[PDB]
Amino acid sequence: RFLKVKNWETDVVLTDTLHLKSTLETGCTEHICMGSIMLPSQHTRVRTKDQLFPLAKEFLDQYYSSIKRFGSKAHMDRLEEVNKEIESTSTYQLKDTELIYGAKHAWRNASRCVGRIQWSKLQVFDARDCTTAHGMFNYICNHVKYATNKGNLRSAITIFPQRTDGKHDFRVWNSQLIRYAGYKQPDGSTLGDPANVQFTEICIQQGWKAPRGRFDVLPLLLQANGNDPELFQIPPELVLEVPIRHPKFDWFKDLGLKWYGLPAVSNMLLEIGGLEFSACPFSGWYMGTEIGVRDYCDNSRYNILEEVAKKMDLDMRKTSSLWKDQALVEINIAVLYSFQSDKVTIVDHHSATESFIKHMENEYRCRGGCPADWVWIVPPMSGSITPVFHQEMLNYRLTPSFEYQPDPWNTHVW
Amino acid sequence: RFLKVKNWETDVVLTDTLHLKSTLETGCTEHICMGSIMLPSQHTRKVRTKDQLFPLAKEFLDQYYSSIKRFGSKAHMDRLEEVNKEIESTSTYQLKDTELIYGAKHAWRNASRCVGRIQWSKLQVFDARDCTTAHGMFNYICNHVKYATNKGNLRSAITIFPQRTDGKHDFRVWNSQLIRYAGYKQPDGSTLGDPANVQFTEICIQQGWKAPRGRFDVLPLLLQANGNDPELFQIPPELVLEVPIRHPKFDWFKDLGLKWYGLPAVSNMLLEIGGLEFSACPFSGWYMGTEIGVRDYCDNSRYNILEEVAKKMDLDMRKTSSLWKDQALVEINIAVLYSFQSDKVTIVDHHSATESFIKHMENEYRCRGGCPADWVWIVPPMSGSITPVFHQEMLNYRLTPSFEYQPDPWNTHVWKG
Ligand code: HEM
Ligand code: HEM
Ligand SMILES: Cc1cc(N)nc(CCc2c(F)c(F)cc(CCCN(C)C)c2F)c1
Ligand SMILES: Cc1cc(N)nc(CCc2c(F)c(F)cc(CCCN(C)C)c2F)c1
Ligand SMILES: C[C@H](O)[C@H](O)[C@H]1CNc2nc(N)[nH]c(=O)c2N1
Ligand SMILES: C[C@H](O)[C@H](O)[C@H]1CNc2nc(N)[nH]c(=O)c2N1
Ligand SMILES: [Zn+2]
């Protein structure tokens, strides 16, 4: 019950005590492991008055422990003050310090995130005074500019007002702040990003004038206080993009590939002390494989493998020539090369997983553990030559947390 | 209760009812997932009385007679009756030949970490339950190797030695695989040969094996019959099919001196059928290319040839973001596949193998109500997401008959002397 994880490449063994603090459920049982389910019910997300105070107490307890004020007057006073506020208002407000700690720890606890060694350097933008979609746009432009930083990317989260009665939710309808559009052709194929075909249609259905290109930056669709969402175009000078070329193949630039520099997830829900922040876009920097392996080479995405292997003149007759694997490596060399050339922050999967092993070491030593989801942590190429492949990981759910939530168009009372 | 799994590349959704027939435990709880634990308590086998044995037998026989469309028949009830009296009077029981064949096929069919299970029904089962000595084991294993190898046209096979009785007369193959290369720790700390096999190599040498001390020395068989001290046997070299590894474009690749054997034959697992434990049950199939090209050759703790291969390719080795490791890895795996195909030795690449597993899995859901699958093990160790299993949700649960791990015998064996 005080669990051991072993690294089978190095024989390092770590003892996990942190999982005993786990609160939420995994979706597994003794009879069945659901470790490969993408979205179990638990990972998705009104709070009654009774559920809220224990959630607040557990959070304030760990907060005051983290500042070595556990059991202090200031601790008990804050517990009482929040306890009174919940009794009266049926909710409560976080102190700035508690909001910042909560957001950093939601990242720290994100068991699927390989980049968590950076978790404590997150820049938290308090947007809880926001009231309109235009204000949300302003907060998001400031986030994008701060985080992009002329290509020296910086981690950031912007936190909009917390859920109240569920009818006044703040929501960013986009899945990411910056994402390329997707159009169904009459021809039957897909232009641009197929993953965003439905969202691209909701944008057009709301007024957007699509250039119908291959890499059209989507507008923001912002919902404040539960109102109808509104379109806003992000200033192009704020959207850093990188043309993709290859350091050896001159024909690579002719493929016309580019990608955006800033990965900014915008559709998740931040849970702190029972409070639910339905609009909390956060951003870091890319691991190369997200673009090169998933975005460019997933069959349900840009799906460029065949085209690249063609230009490489690879034997595509048989799968055992591993033409897909060759092409895959070259595409991913090009992504890393392009970002590094344009001085846009990016990390290769080798450095990132090595960092995560170091991070796990640190968390086990200083925290007693590190929830980690192997299915997600292991990169989607060259898995076993990265150290995380050989790392046993314990997956459990700690709070504060980032959770998934239903897409807004399914829920929005129009 | 029904459970759904989704393929996120095709949106195909399958419904699992088979997990309801699951008896054993996973290691996970509502509060922790142990999905990535390599050798969890539940997948191993350290010792079993007449108390729990008849329901295990009854459950198996019910499954068996259902599969042959004889559930509730007179043959079914008489067999249950017969097994029951044999248990209470002798404390164990013997499987019929048909039941053993069924049991071994279904143990493979239930192996949730095995990507090659489309083949499960075409398993050649060799009954070695009349074996009594290590020499008899050697003879059975030789015949298995020769049959399974079939001059490179590999055929799946399993050889099943007598079941455990009191845990003091076990049959065991001390080798982890029937064919495997020696590993030698040198005084300077480096390893010659396969570092994974250093401990077993040292046992063989202690038992009298004259080691050639090369990089690819086929290990001797260390065979334990009836709980006696194990004995050394050399597999006839004419029975050990090997492939020199060359590359279709890089002529310097052959000069690395690499080869591998053609027949992957796991020999240290435990086969559980109807509560009976078969502690010596070597089984063999054919290789997926990445087992050799990725894991055997490129694991840092194995042959670890990435450095020298990338040196000879003249890749940028100063920074990892050149992906020199990924580039060399692909070329090594091309070479492995090219060499086996050129020598007409059966092998499957990870694209073909994972595509077949998806078809197998969908078929199993339709005809069986499910297919237990361990994503962590099914996804190949390179190019994971450009194979279709990466995108496939999988439910992992334990069905019997099963293959289980057991502790290495040198840690449990009571030495006779
Ligand atoms: C700073 C550089 C970062 C890197 C290199 C990184 C890396 C990654 C990668 C590769 C994934 C898998 C994503 C996918 O395959 O779709 C992921 C997931 C995730 N990241 Fe990080 N990330 C970074 C920053 C952040 C930040 C700043 C946050 C939050 C403040 C965060 C929260 C998450 C969460 C919650 C997930 C998993 C979503 C889920 O549960 O399904 N990441 N990360
Ligand atoms: C016919 C071709 C076969 C292929 C291509 C194949 C492929 C594989 C691969 C790649 C693995 C992962 C192994 C590793 O990474 O160490 C595996 C695991 C496994 N295979 Fe198969 N296999 C085949 C035949 C068989 C047969 C004949 C049996 C038994 C009769 C079998 C039983 C298993 C079991 C029990 C495991 C899991 C070991 C564990 O639980 O840790 N396989 N297979
Ligand atoms: C901050 C950051 C850093 C980084 N390197 N990458 C990203 C984008 C990758 C990414 C997430 F991080 C995330 F939390 C959620 C998703 C959606 C998953 C949808 N999928 C289940 C179908 C996602 F795509 C963000
Ligand atoms: C029949 C067959 C077909 C095929 N293609 N490959 C193989 C070898 C791979 C393999 C198994 F299949 C298996 F069941 C067990 C192990 C031991 C795992 C040790 N691990 C905990 C460190 C193993 F290595 C065998
Ligand atoms: C079905 C499976 O869980 C799904 O394809 C997962 C696999 N692992 C992943 N890992 C990461 N990092 N990102 C993903 O989207 C996925 N997809
Ligand atoms: C720690 C982790 O479970 C371990 O490295 C696993 C990962 N997946 C694997 N998958 C296969 N096929 N074979 C393995 O040996 C492993 N090792
Ligand atoms: Zn699990």
Short mmCIF file of N, CA and C in Angstrom, two decimals, chain A residues 3-5 8-9 19 22-39 293-294 297-300 305 319-322 324-326 328-330 332-333 336 340 348-351 374-375 380-385 389-396, chain B residues 3 5 8-9 19 22-39 294-295 298-301 306 319-323 325-327 329-331 333-334 337 341 349-352 375-376 381-386 390-397:
data_model
loop_
_atom_site.label_atom_id
_atom_site.label_comp_id
_atom_site.label_asym_id
_atom_site.label_seq_id
_atom_site.Cartn_x
_atom_site.Cartn_y
_atom_site.Cartn_z
N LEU A 3 3.53 2.15 -2.19
CA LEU A 3 3.82 1.45 -3.44
C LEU A 3 5.20 1.79 -4.00
N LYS A 4 5.77 0.82 -4.70
CA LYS A 4 7.07 0.95 -5.35
C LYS A 4 6.89 1.03 -6.86
N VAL A 5 7.63 1.93 -7.50
CA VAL A 5 7.75 1.95 -8.96
C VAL A 5 9.21 1.73 -9.31
N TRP A 8 13.02 0.06 -15.36
CA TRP A 8 13.64 -1.20 -15.76
C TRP A 8 14.89 -1.02 -16.60
N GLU A 9 15.22 0.22 -16.97
CA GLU A 9 16.45 0.55 -17.68
C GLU A 9 17.59 0.87 -16.72
N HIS A 19 0.06 8.75 -3.35
CA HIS A 19 -1.21 8.23 -3.85
C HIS A 19 -2.22 8.05 -2.73
N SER A 22 -4.86 10.52 -2.63
CA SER A 22 -5.74 10.60 -3.79
C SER A 22 -7.19 10.72 -3.36
N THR A 23 -7.94 11.53 -4.09
CA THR A 23 -9.33 11.80 -3.76
C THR A 23 -10.27 11.19 -4.78
N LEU A 24 -10.18 11.62 -6.04
CA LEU A 24 -11.08 11.15 -7.09
C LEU A 24 -10.72 9.71 -7.49
N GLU A 25 -11.51 9.17 -8.42
CA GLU A 25 -11.40 7.78 -8.86
C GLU A 25 -10.78 7.69 -10.25
N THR A 26 -10.21 6.52 -10.54
CA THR A 26 -9.48 6.30 -11.79
C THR A 26 -10.34 5.72 -12.91
N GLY A 27 -11.44 5.06 -12.58
CA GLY A 27 -12.15 4.27 -13.57
C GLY A 27 -11.71 2.83 -13.66
N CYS A 28 -10.61 2.46 -13.01
CA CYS A 28 -10.21 1.06 -12.92
C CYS A 28 -10.85 0.40 -11.70
N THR A 29 -10.90 -0.92 -11.73
CA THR A 29 -11.28 -1.73 -10.58
C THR A 29 -10.25 -2.85 -10.43
N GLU A 30 -10.43 -3.67 -9.40
CA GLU A 30 -9.60 -4.86 -9.26
C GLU A 30 -9.83 -5.85 -10.40
N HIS A 31 -10.99 -5.79 -11.05
CA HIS A 31 -11.33 -6.72 -12.12
C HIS A 31 -11.03 -6.19 -13.52
N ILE A 32 -10.82 -4.88 -13.69
CA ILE A 32 -10.60 -4.37 -15.03
C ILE A 32 -9.82 -3.06 -15.00
N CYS A 33 -8.79 -2.97 -15.82
CA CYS A 33 -7.98 -1.77 -15.95
C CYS A 33 -8.47 -0.99 -17.16
N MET A 34 -8.83 0.28 -16.93
CA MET A 34 -9.26 1.18 -17.99
C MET A 34 -8.19 2.19 -18.36
N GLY A 35 -6.93 1.83 -18.14
CA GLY A 35 -5.84 2.77 -18.33
C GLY A 35 -5.71 3.31 -19.74
N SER A 36 -6.33 2.68 -20.74
CA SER A 36 -6.23 3.19 -22.10
C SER A 36 -7.51 3.86 -22.57
N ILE A 37 -8.49 4.03 -21.69
CA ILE A 37 -9.69 4.76 -22.06
C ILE A 37 -9.35 6.24 -22.13
N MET A 38 -9.70 6.88 -23.24
CA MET A 38 -9.32 8.27 -23.44
C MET A 38 -10.01 9.19 -22.44
N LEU A 39 -11.31 8.98 -22.21
CA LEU A 39 -12.12 9.89 -21.40
C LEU A 39 -13.08 9.09 -20.55
N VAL A 293 4.38 14.12 -35.29
CA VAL A 293 3.78 12.78 -35.27
C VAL A 293 2.26 12.84 -35.31
N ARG A 294 1.66 13.59 -34.38
CA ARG A 294 0.21 13.58 -34.24
C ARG A 294 -0.46 14.51 -35.26
N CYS A 297 0.87 13.58 -38.98
CA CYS A 297 0.87 12.21 -39.48
C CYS A 297 -0.26 11.32 -38.99
N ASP A 298 -1.05 11.74 -37.99
CA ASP A 298 -2.29 11.02 -37.71
C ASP A 298 -3.10 10.89 -39.00
N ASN A 299 -3.73 9.72 -39.17
CA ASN A 299 -4.54 9.50 -40.36
C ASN A 299 -5.79 10.37 -40.36
N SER A 300 -6.31 10.71 -39.18
CA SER A 300 -7.46 11.59 -39.08
C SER A 300 -7.07 13.05 -38.92
N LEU A 305 1.98 11.62 -44.44
CA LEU A 305 3.01 10.60 -44.57
C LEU A 305 3.21 10.20 -46.03
N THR A 319 4.75 -2.57 -46.34
CA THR A 319 4.90 -1.89 -45.06
C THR A 319 6.24 -2.19 -44.41
N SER A 320 6.80 -3.38 -44.69
CA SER A 320 8.05 -3.83 -44.09
C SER A 320 9.27 -3.07 -44.60
N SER A 321 9.12 -2.20 -45.62
CA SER A 321 10.19 -1.26 -45.91
C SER A 321 10.29 -0.17 -44.86
N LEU A 322 9.29 -0.06 -43.99
CA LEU A 322 9.22 0.98 -42.96
C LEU A 322 9.34 2.38 -43.58
N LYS A 324 6.91 4.45 -43.81
CA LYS A 324 6.22 5.37 -42.91
C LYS A 324 7.13 5.80 -41.77
N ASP A 325 7.92 4.87 -41.23
CA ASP A 325 8.78 5.21 -40.11
C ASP A 325 9.89 6.16 -40.53
N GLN A 326 10.47 5.92 -41.71
CA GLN A 326 11.50 6.81 -42.24
C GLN A 326 10.95 8.21 -42.42
N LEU A 328 8.39 9.46 -41.10
CA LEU A 328 8.00 10.03 -39.81
C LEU A 328 9.18 10.71 -39.14
N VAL A 329 10.33 10.03 -39.09
CA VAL A 329 11.52 10.64 -38.50
C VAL A 329 11.86 11.95 -39.21
N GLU A 330 11.87 11.94 -40.55
CA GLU A 330 12.28 13.12 -41.30
C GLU A 330 11.34 14.30 -41.04
N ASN A 332 9.70 14.83 -38.39
CA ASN A 332 9.92 15.33 -37.04
C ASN A 332 11.27 16.01 -36.89
N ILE A 333 12.25 15.64 -37.71
CA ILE A 333 13.49 16.42 -37.77
C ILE A 333 13.18 17.83 -38.27
N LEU A 336 11.38 20.19 -35.54
CA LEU A 336 12.37 20.67 -34.58
C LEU A 336 13.34 21.64 -35.23
N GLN A 340 13.64 25.60 -34.08
CA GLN A 340 14.95 26.01 -33.57
C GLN A 340 15.55 27.11 -34.44
N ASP A 348 12.38 18.46 -27.99
CA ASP A 348 12.22 17.14 -28.60
C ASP A 348 11.79 16.12 -27.55
N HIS A 349 11.22 15.01 -28.04
CA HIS A 349 10.71 14.00 -27.12
C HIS A 349 11.82 13.37 -26.28
N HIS A 350 13.07 13.39 -26.75
CA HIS A 350 14.14 12.82 -25.94
C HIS A 350 14.42 13.71 -24.73
N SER A 351 14.58 15.01 -24.96
CA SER A 351 14.85 15.91 -23.85
C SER A 351 13.67 15.97 -22.88
N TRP A 374 1.21 6.51 -18.07
CA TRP A 374 2.19 6.00 -19.03
C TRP A 374 1.66 6.07 -20.46
N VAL A 375 0.39 5.73 -20.66
CA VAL A 375 -0.21 5.74 -21.99
C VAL A 375 -0.04 7.11 -22.66
N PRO A 380 4.64 9.41 -28.94
CA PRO A 380 4.01 8.60 -29.99
C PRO A 380 4.97 8.13 -31.08
N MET A 381 6.27 8.36 -30.94
CA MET A 381 7.26 7.70 -31.78
C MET A 381 8.45 7.31 -30.92
N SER A 382 9.18 6.30 -31.37
CA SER A 382 10.44 5.90 -30.75
C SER A 382 10.29 5.66 -29.25
N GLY A 383 9.13 5.14 -28.84
CA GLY A 383 8.80 4.99 -27.44
C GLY A 383 9.89 4.39 -26.56
N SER A 384 10.40 3.21 -26.91
CA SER A 384 11.30 2.52 -26.00
C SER A 384 12.73 3.07 -26.00
N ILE A 385 13.07 4.02 -26.87
CA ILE A 385 14.39 4.63 -26.73
C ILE A 385 14.32 5.91 -25.92
N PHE A 389 9.56 5.06 -21.29
CA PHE A 389 9.03 3.75 -21.66
C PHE A 389 9.33 2.72 -20.58
N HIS A 390 10.53 2.79 -20.01
CA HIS A 390 11.00 1.81 -19.05
C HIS A 390 10.63 2.18 -17.62
N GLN A 391 9.91 3.29 -17.44
CA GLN A 391 9.55 3.80 -16.12
C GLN A 391 8.16 3.30 -15.75
N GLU A 392 8.08 2.47 -14.71
CA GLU A 392 6.77 2.21 -14.12
C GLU A 392 6.18 3.50 -13.55
N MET A 393 4.87 3.66 -13.72
CA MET A 393 4.19 4.87 -13.27
C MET A 393 2.90 4.47 -12.57
N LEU A 394 2.56 5.20 -11.52
CA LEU A 394 1.30 5.02 -10.83
C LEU A 394 0.40 6.16 -11.24
N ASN A 395 -0.79 5.83 -11.73
CA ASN A 395 -1.74 6.86 -12.12
C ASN A 395 -2.83 6.98 -11.07
N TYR A 396 -2.99 8.19 -10.54
CA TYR A 396 -4.04 8.48 -9.59
C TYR A 396 -4.41 9.95 -9.73
N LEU B 3 -19.58 -2.65 -21.45
CA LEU B 3 -18.54 -1.62 -21.52
C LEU B 3 -18.17 -1.36 -22.98
N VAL B 5 -15.57 0.39 -25.89
CA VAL B 5 -14.25 0.89 -26.26
C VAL B 5 -14.34 1.55 -27.62
N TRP B 8 -10.23 5.84 -31.80
CA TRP B 8 -10.30 7.28 -32.02
C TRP B 8 -9.82 7.70 -33.40
N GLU B 9 -9.33 6.76 -34.20
CA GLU B 9 -8.99 7.07 -35.58
C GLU B 9 -10.11 6.71 -36.55
N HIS B 19 -15.65 -9.22 -20.13
CA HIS B 19 -14.99 -8.88 -18.88
C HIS B 19 -15.79 -9.36 -17.67
N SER B 22 -14.48 -12.45 -16.00
CA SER B 22 -13.13 -12.31 -15.46
C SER B 22 -13.11 -12.68 -13.99
N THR B 23 -12.17 -13.56 -13.62
CA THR B 23 -12.03 -14.02 -12.24
C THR B 23 -10.89 -13.31 -11.52
N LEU B 24 -9.67 -13.43 -12.05
CA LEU B 24 -8.47 -12.90 -11.41
C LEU B 24 -8.56 -11.37 -11.28
N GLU B 25 -7.59 -10.81 -10.55
CA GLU B 25 -7.52 -9.37 -10.29
C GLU B 25 -6.47 -8.70 -11.18
N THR B 26 -6.62 -7.38 -11.35
CA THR B 26 -5.75 -6.61 -12.24
C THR B 26 -4.56 -5.99 -11.54
N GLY B 27 -4.69 -5.66 -10.27
CA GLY B 27 -3.72 -4.84 -9.58
C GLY B 27 -4.16 -3.40 -9.41
N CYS B 28 -5.12 -2.93 -10.21
CA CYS B 28 -5.62 -1.58 -10.04
C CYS B 28 -6.67 -1.54 -8.94
N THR B 29 -6.98 -0.33 -8.50
CA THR B 29 -8.11 -0.08 -7.62
C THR B 29 -8.87 1.12 -8.16
N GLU B 30 -10.00 1.42 -7.54
CA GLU B 30 -10.72 2.65 -7.87
C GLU B 30 -9.84 3.88 -7.73
N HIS B 31 -8.76 3.80 -6.95
CA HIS B 31 -7.98 4.97 -6.61
C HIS B 31 -6.57 4.96 -7.17
N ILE B 32 -6.12 3.85 -7.76
CA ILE B 32 -4.82 3.85 -8.40
C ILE B 32 -4.87 2.89 -9.57
N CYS B 33 -4.30 3.32 -10.69
CA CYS B 33 -4.12 2.46 -11.85
C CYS B 33 -2.69 1.96 -11.88
N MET B 34 -2.53 0.63 -11.90
CA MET B 34 -1.22 0.01 -12.02
C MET B 34 -0.95 -0.50 -13.43
N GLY B 35 -1.66 0.05 -14.42
CA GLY B 35 -1.52 -0.32 -15.82
C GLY B 35 -0.12 -0.43 -16.39
N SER B 36 0.84 0.33 -15.85
CA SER B 36 2.21 0.30 -16.37
C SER B 36 3.18 -0.46 -15.46
N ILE B 37 2.68 -1.12 -14.42
CA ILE B 37 3.55 -1.95 -13.60
C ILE B 37 3.90 -3.22 -14.38
N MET B 38 5.20 -3.49 -14.50
CA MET B 38 5.67 -4.58 -15.36
C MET B 38 5.22 -5.95 -14.85
N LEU B 39 5.56 -6.28 -13.61
CA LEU B 39 5.33 -7.62 -13.07
C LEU B 39 4.47 -7.54 -11.81
N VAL B 294 14.24 -2.97 -32.18
CA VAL B 294 14.06 -1.91 -31.20
C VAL B 294 14.57 -2.33 -29.83
N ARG B 295 14.00 -3.40 -29.28
CA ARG B 295 14.28 -3.78 -27.90
C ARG B 295 15.62 -4.52 -27.78
N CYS B 298 18.50 -2.14 -29.37
CA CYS B 298 18.60 -0.72 -29.08
C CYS B 298 18.25 -0.33 -27.65
N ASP B 299 17.68 -1.23 -26.85
CA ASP B 299 17.59 -0.94 -25.43
C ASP B 299 18.98 -0.64 -24.90
N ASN B 300 19.09 0.44 -24.12
CA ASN B 300 20.36 0.80 -23.49
C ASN B 300 20.93 -0.36 -22.69
N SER B 301 20.06 -1.16 -22.05
CA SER B 301 20.49 -2.28 -21.22
C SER B 301 20.61 -3.58 -22.01
N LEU B 306 22.75 1.63 -30.93
CA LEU B 306 22.38 2.91 -31.52
C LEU B 306 23.61 3.78 -31.78
N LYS B 319 23.53 16.73 -30.67
CA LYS B 319 22.27 17.11 -30.06
C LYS B 319 21.21 16.04 -30.32
N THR B 320 20.38 15.77 -29.31
CA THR B 320 19.32 14.78 -29.46
C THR B 320 18.23 15.25 -30.41
N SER B 321 18.03 16.57 -30.54
CA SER B 321 16.99 17.09 -31.44
C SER B 321 17.35 16.91 -32.90
N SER B 322 18.53 16.37 -33.22
CA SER B 322 18.76 15.88 -34.57
C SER B 322 18.01 14.59 -34.83
N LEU B 323 17.46 13.96 -33.79
CA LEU B 323 16.77 12.67 -33.88
C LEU B 323 17.68 11.60 -34.48
N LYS B 325 19.00 9.26 -32.89
CA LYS B 325 18.58 7.97 -32.34
C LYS B 325 17.41 7.40 -33.12
N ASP B 326 16.42 8.25 -33.43
CA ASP B 326 15.25 7.81 -34.18
C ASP B 326 15.62 7.40 -35.60
N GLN B 327 16.58 8.11 -36.20
CA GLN B 327 17.02 7.76 -37.55
C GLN B 327 17.72 6.41 -37.57
N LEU B 329 17.47 4.04 -35.35
CA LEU B 329 16.50 3.02 -34.98
C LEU B 329 15.75 2.49 -36.20
N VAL B 330 15.28 3.39 -37.06
CA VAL B 330 14.52 2.95 -38.23
C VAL B 330 15.40 2.11 -39.15
N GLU B 331 16.64 2.53 -39.37
CA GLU B 331 17.52 1.78 -40.27
C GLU B 331 17.82 0.39 -39.73
N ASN B 333 15.84 -1.34 -37.84
CA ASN B 333 14.66 -2.18 -37.96
C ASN B 333 14.36 -2.54 -39.41
N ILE B 334 14.74 -1.68 -40.35
CA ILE B 334 14.71 -2.06 -41.76
C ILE B 334 15.62 -3.26 -41.99
N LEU B 337 14.19 -6.65 -40.66
CA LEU B 337 13.13 -7.16 -41.51
C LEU B 337 13.67 -7.63 -42.85
N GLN B 341 13.41 -11.64 -44.17
CA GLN B 341 12.71 -11.90 -45.42
C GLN B 341 13.65 -12.46 -46.48
N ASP B 349 6.33 -7.26 -39.60
CA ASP B 349 6.64 -5.91 -39.17
C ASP B 349 5.50 -5.40 -38.30
N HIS B 350 5.78 -4.33 -37.55
CA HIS B 350 4.81 -3.85 -36.57
C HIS B 350 3.59 -3.20 -37.23
N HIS B 351 3.69 -2.74 -38.47
CA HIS B 351 2.50 -2.25 -39.14
C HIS B 351 1.54 -3.39 -39.45
N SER B 352 2.04 -4.45 -40.09
CA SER B 352 1.19 -5.61 -40.37
C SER B 352 0.63 -6.20 -39.08
N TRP B 375 -2.85 -2.24 -23.58
CA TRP B 375 -2.36 -1.21 -24.49
C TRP B 375 -0.87 -0.96 -24.29
N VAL B 376 -0.41 -0.95 -23.04
CA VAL B 376 0.96 -0.60 -22.72
C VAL B 376 1.92 -1.53 -23.43
N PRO B 381 7.09 -0.55 -29.78
CA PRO B 381 8.03 0.36 -29.10
C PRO B 381 8.66 1.41 -30.01
N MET B 382 8.26 1.48 -31.27
CA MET B 382 8.61 2.58 -32.14
C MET B 382 7.38 2.92 -32.96
N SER B 383 7.34 4.17 -33.45
CA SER B 383 6.30 4.63 -34.38
C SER B 383 4.90 4.35 -33.85
N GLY B 384 4.73 4.45 -32.53
CA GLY B 384 3.51 3.98 -31.90
C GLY B 384 2.24 4.52 -32.53
N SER B 385 2.14 5.84 -32.71
CA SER B 385 0.85 6.37 -33.15
C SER B 385 0.60 6.22 -34.66
N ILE B 386 1.56 5.76 -35.46
CA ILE B 386 1.22 5.51 -36.85
C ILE B 386 0.85 4.04 -37.00
N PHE B 390 -2.45 2.19 -31.38
CA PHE B 390 -2.25 3.37 -30.55
C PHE B 390 -3.57 4.08 -30.30
N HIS B 391 -4.43 4.11 -31.31
CA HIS B 391 -5.68 4.86 -31.29
C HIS B 391 -6.84 4.03 -30.78
N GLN B 392 -6.57 2.80 -30.37
CA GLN B 392 -7.60 1.86 -29.98
C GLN B 392 -7.67 1.81 -28.46
N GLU B 393 -8.82 2.16 -27.90
CA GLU B 393 -9.03 1.91 -26.48
C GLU B 393 -9.10 0.40 -26.25
N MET B 394 -8.55 -0.04 -25.12
CA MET B 394 -8.49 -1.46 -24.80
C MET B 394 -8.85 -1.67 -23.34
N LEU B 395 -9.59 -2.74 -23.07
CA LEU B 395 -9.91 -3.13 -21.71
C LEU B 395 -9.01 -4.28 -21.32
N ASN B 396 -8.34 -4.16 -20.18
CA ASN B 396 -7.43 -5.18 -19.72
C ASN B 396 -8.07 -5.88 -18.54
N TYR B 397 -8.20 -7.20 -18.64
CA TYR B 397 -8.71 -8.01 -17.55
C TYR B 397 -8.14 -9.41 -17.71
#
